[PDB]
Design a protein around this ligand. Structure first.
Ligand code: NCC
Ligand code: NCC
Ligand code: NCC
Ligand code: NCC
Ligand code: UDP
Ligand code: UDP
Ligand code: UDP
Ligand code: UDP
Lengths: 382, 384, 382, 384
């Protein structure tokens, strides 16, 4: 009897780490049935219609759900969780999954975990034990408590889950699946990918990738920091790919910052919503430096030794190699402009903290090991 | 003095018994607190006894009422109910502009409230945090703990569980359960005329049973079978029995059907009721011959009167209980349950105080005033 | 190319008139594909889990939706319409229907019509031109305006649609599909159906079928009328099948009326949620009389000449034969008890106002006639 | 005197231009009316210009704000938006306890409002009822008419349409459009400094174009193509052009993308804007060289100033228009549109008053006071 697996994807931020697993599951039809659910940001033009990435990977999408309430603020974030919760249960009764794969720390993943847990559907939670110093910590660890099975990416994440009283029998230390793609990365014509996304006259290691997200707890500070960050980038004046923000609450106010600085119509800048993951890896792997507060900066790019400037409070407490320079109180242009001079064009050693490149096969085994006779979470309090 | 704006949301009598004392406390100190009350969930539902009325009869001004329950009385409907609260609450919370929100317990409804507050940067005081009940409710309770910024637990073991789950000890208050404020202040009026109202004219103290059994959502077909056998035992044991309708939504109509097909609703020996007012209910359980089923009251509250208890099934496995509680986990035959009734009916145990000292509310009011309004962000104490 | 037809059913009240069409469509696989959606009351124990009727007719249910908000009042009725509207669009994008069949005048049908119309899906509205003197008139006629194609049951209903400025080219006068079953009704052992539902010692034409619904506009009056109606039935003291109410708003207060009169535990009464349509036809066809305010009383039972007492304001303005006695101001027990003496055990001639028994084949032709090149409603104002 | 409790819900600038005058009227007579304002829909959305601010700047106390729009900018999202209003409104309406609710127009949002009021037995005054625009909006408008208990129409032909649709003539008031209260009272201030603010420093009266084109939801790919050609014409015709973003949700982002890829947002000849305040907008269109697209303003309002209009496509087919409007239904090439621009740009027509006399509001206030509060149930005049 095949294991019926449902994977729900809501944003490129999970799709980069779930697609490898989906590919793994699909390559073994003898042990697994796969149903894919697309919801959230994927269906939204502002976010780059990233459901197309799923279509271009040739996955049959069973179900599409509009689950985002418009407003781009905290109220809307909450209403979005509620919208997924009214819409999902009937889809889950139809699909009748044995287990559901949930990734990460976003509001959307809490909806998925909640709906599965309350309907007695097993949950495999990916990227569980980590620390990022925002509201996301809260969400991540609340999902951990709902989830029946856990897949973490580091030893320190494993120990955190065990410290949080999770059953060690239900934890698998696999590595991040993104590393399956990073450490298997086809450097094709990487120059023609640099030329596509940054411009014709750009040379390897001579450009910046800028990706900064609002922190929902302090939008007014997120605005001010982003202004100063752009001012620095303008002064530093080397070719810069600016990704639009990808946390919803505060997002339009951050986009307005870019608009009023003329970033959208500037020779030095390229404003984009989403770069396909395989192309994005090549971009960050050959970047002069990366700046902002993406998880990519602190978790992924270490693999290529790309210099990183991590700004603000998001990612405080994450494990990072020598390549990452933190500037918490990025409260002036000078501080940020300095960090750019220090880091731009350096080369660090290649780290492997968040993965060994064989996460997926370990995960597939862990899924086959699951015997279908209980379920109820056990909480090791002593 | 800038007053602390406190919003208390109540969804079910199961939280209202433990929140009402706090609401009374807050309301008695207008100089330090502003109070807004939000009523949602089960309270607005006839099947559950229109228990919003209990709030009206306590004289609280209800600011807002929200229909948040999706009909269906199954797991899908439970989930859609959480979602319905989440689409409805944020605009109410932006209007009310609370500094802190009080959330109680382990039910699906409390997870909606915690979620909405946490994602909108509203502070959360979570009541009854560190306990263990061995159902899906453990999961929910502990997920709420993680969202919540401030914690009020009822026992030392609950406090240690929160600390073991990596919560900041600075944000934990060990107060006791607020229900004990009412239990240990329970001035037994004419308790006989309360027995007569609810059980019948000819019933004597310690000669009746209070039966309160809830479905476990994880295994409804087993909940059904157990309840059938439980009623069969109660019919054979044949002493006057107050049967409270179930009060977990998923599986509820199938449990009600069990009662209907056994003729419990029209039987001389039984009284089928949705809700007994808390003050009257305390008197009922305090003088009962025994209590049977899987209520939290059985394992947490009635110990205070030494009332014998039969706890059936998997719900409440792992809760702290005094000598008054007899567990029958595999209640898989009528004989086992009928035996437990013979053993326990009419006994008297010593009065325990595990879940409270009777001064929870004043400790809570102080803890609320102590909160300085400059951060917020939860701290997670990860000792390796 | 086959016509993709979606039929959504929400309540037994539409299912009695849609099932015949569904059967017709399913019997012609060469011209039609059928997808069935079940939602609303069908999934609710209080209403008799009537999705089972759909399962027992062997229809493959594609999708099930929980769309009812609990509360059994007007607010809940509205929230229920809204719940269907958030849940349906993604189902309709998946099913990709060419046309959707909507029946009747209930809040649920307005949700269906609204969602179809705003998504450019064609609508065939069944039972369009009629008059019943409650809020339902409003709803029925608002659905008419959304709907692209109309199937009415009488000539007077056809003229009403034309008077309301509908295009006569898009109206089909077919008859009510319920008449396909009424005028083809297998009287099997009808006595053993009487014995099942009323009791062992009951003789044909010596029992009452009581079916009274709350009027949402005046619940307090609905309560009082129902009390007096039951009091009359108790005094008249002939075996009575009492169907629980089947309009949601006010329903629990009406059920409470029955409970406090001891109707549920009385030798003379049988309280039931739903009698299967085929069995119900036999019951009403052989009844001594029928009482209350069902549409069955004024539209269907005329076919058997069964005496009818229509109480209150619901059904004022419906077309009725000689068999129906109206008592609008049923404001005392005596008036109702009198109406019972007058009507119980009489036999009227068999009328055919609402159908000829060939509605379905006419409808199937009308569906095949639809050429798939526009759509936009035309409003004949002159 | 028991005051009439009036709730006005506003969802979009498209209703707010015609409801604000009534809200002002009601607010100026506190002795006869209590007013509660509900803001929902587009008003709370940055893409639409945060137009709740227009309500704040008119000094109305907003009782309630509701996020009711589902994101997606397509037909599915439009429907889910209606549903979202329907789950959120009933608890607000039970709280506000209105005697009557004012609903305007033909948009998906107004159907939610009408539905919720009608099913809760709240009386409805529907504004702008009897008109014809040849899209799905006809369907919506006429479905709202059927729900609504009281009707306020703007023309004699609209009145006859309502009567032909079997509405009770006793419940129809022919008032005029309230927008005309503002148009015919439009004290032209420094209109040049308003032209300079919105179009640029060097622009002269009657030498600019106002372009406002909305997608038709029934045929988005055709809406796209038409808009491309329209912009190409405007680029060739090369006179200063205010381009308003689209204001029908379904298809909106694909229309915005058209503008983006033509470089309209960064062109000397164009100014891309979301919303111009109504009072300033009147001055813009009153002095425009011509107006182009498919706004209702083009066919209903600007006639008052004799401003030339080009109405493109199927939206507005069947509306009553003066000599100032040139229809180009099959705008299928750039040449056809460029021609229409040459023909119309800079002309001056006579001032028409088809949609109003400028005293709509006072007639409406009287009609509200006339309502006696003893029924309600709609009557449907079915003459055979
Ligand atoms: C600039 C560039 O190099 N390429 C084009 C990009 C690029 O292909 C994608 O971003 C890839 O993900 O696409 C285009 O542009 P794009 O689709 O980025 O849209 C840009 C506009 O979208 C608004 N925006 C952005 C993010 C967000 N969360 N909310 C928003 O409202 C901003 O106001 C901004 O002006 C296109 O397809 O139309 C056109 C652009 O020219
Ligand atoms: C039985 C009794 O002793 N007293 C009365 C009780 C009692 O006072 C209250 O329940 C107290 O909370 O009230 C009445 O009856 P009550 O309100 O209990 O309604 C009885 C019916 O409720 C249905 N039910 C209950 C719970 C649930 N989850 N779903 C349900 O469908 C059952 O079908 C059952 O028949 C009353 O108010 O009308 C009338 C009863 O006679
Ligand atoms: C009475 C009888 O002849 N037969 C049985 C009927 C019958 O089979 C069905 O109604 C058929 O549709 O079924 C049973 O009973 P039933 O399922 O009707 O449930 C009866 C109880 O449901 C509550 N109710 C009813 C309608 C409504 N809208 N809301 C409600 O809360 C009432 O309080 C009432 O007490 C059964 O299956 O359990 C048991 C009954 O014994
Ligand atoms: C252009 C101009 O003349 N003035 C400014 C305008 C203007 O004052 C207002 O629009 C008036 O309502 O405001 C600004 O710009 P504005 O708020 O128009 O934002 C421009 C961006 O909005 C996106 N958009 C618009 C509508 C829609 N449905 N979806 C969208 O994604 C487009 O991508 C577009 O690039 C501002 O407030 O920041 C800044 C602009 O510079
Ligand atoms: O244009 C992009 C930008 C990011 N990413 C990937 O998307 C994921 C999430 O990055 P993002 O900044 O969107 O969210 P965060 O991880 O910072 O929460 C990471 O795996 C990135 O490698 C991508 O594929 N294309
Ligand atoms: O008729 C009743 C039955 C119970 N309770 C109280 O309801 C609360 C919750 O009991 P329930 O069994 O409904 O929920 P649980 O706590 O078991 O989740 C406890 O404080 C009980 O003492 C009450 O006030 N009246
Ligand atoms: O037990 C019943 C009662 C009614 N009906 C049928 O259900 C439909 C609706 O009747 P109801 O009173 O439920 O609603 P109404 O038509 O009065 O709005 C009619 O076709 C009846 O013949 C049925 O099949 N079984
Ligand atoms: O910048 C603007 C553009 C339009 N309008 C007014 O908005 C209303 C609706 O116009 P729109 O084209 O947005 O909607 P429509 O009426 O076309 O549905 C009309 O009264 C316009 O005069 C406005 O006040 N400011």
């Amino acid at each position: 009897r095949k294991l019926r697996v449902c994977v729900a994807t809501c944003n490129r931020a999970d799709y980069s780490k779930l697609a490898p697993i989906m590919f793994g599951i699909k390559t073994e039809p003898e042990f697994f049935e796969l149903d894919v659910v697309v919801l959230g940001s994927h269906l939204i033009d502002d976010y780059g219609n990233t459901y197309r990435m799923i279509e271009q990977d040739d996955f049959d999408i069973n179900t599409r759900l509009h689950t985002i309430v418009r407003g781009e603020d905290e109220a809307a974030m909450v209403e979005s969780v509620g919208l997924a919760l009214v819409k999902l249960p009937d889809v889950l009764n139809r699909l009748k999954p044995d287990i559901m794969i949930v990734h990460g720390d976003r509001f959307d993943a809490l909806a998925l975990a909640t709906s599965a847990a309350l309907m007695n559907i097993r949950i495999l939670h990916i990227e569980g034990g980590e620390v990022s110093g925002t509201i996301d910590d809260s969400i991540r660890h609340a999902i951990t408590k709902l989830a029946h099975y856990h897949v973490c990416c580091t030893r320190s994440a494993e120990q955190h889950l065990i410290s949080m009283c999770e059953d060690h029998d239900r934890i698998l230390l696999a590595g991040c699946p993104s590393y399956d793609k990073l450490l298997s990365a086809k450097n094709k014509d990487y120059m023609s990918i640099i030329r596509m996304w940054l411009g014709d006259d750009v040379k390897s290691k001579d450009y910046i990738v800028a990706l900064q997200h609002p922190v929902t707890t302090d939008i007014k500070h997120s605005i001010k920091m982003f202004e100063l960050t752009l001012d620095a980038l303008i002064s530093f004046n080397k070719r810069t790919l600016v990704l639009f923000p990808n946390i919803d609450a505060g997002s339009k106010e951050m986009v307005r910052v870019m608009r009023k600085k003329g970033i959208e119509h500037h020779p030095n800048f390229r404003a984009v919503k989403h770069v396909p993951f395989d192309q994005f890896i090549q971009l960050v792997a050959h970047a002069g430096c990366m700046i902002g507060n993406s998880s990519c900066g602190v978790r992924e790019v270490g693999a290529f030794g790309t210099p990183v400037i991590n700004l603000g409070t998001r990612q405080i407490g994450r494990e990072t190699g020598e390549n990452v320079l933190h500037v918490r109180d990025a409260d002036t242009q000078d501080k940020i402009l300095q960090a750019l001079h220090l880091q731009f064009g350096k080369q660090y050693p290649c780290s492997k903290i968040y993965g060994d490149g064989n996460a997926v096969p370990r995960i597939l085994k862990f899924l086959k090991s699951i015997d279908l006779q209980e379920p109820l979470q056990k909480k090791f309090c002593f």
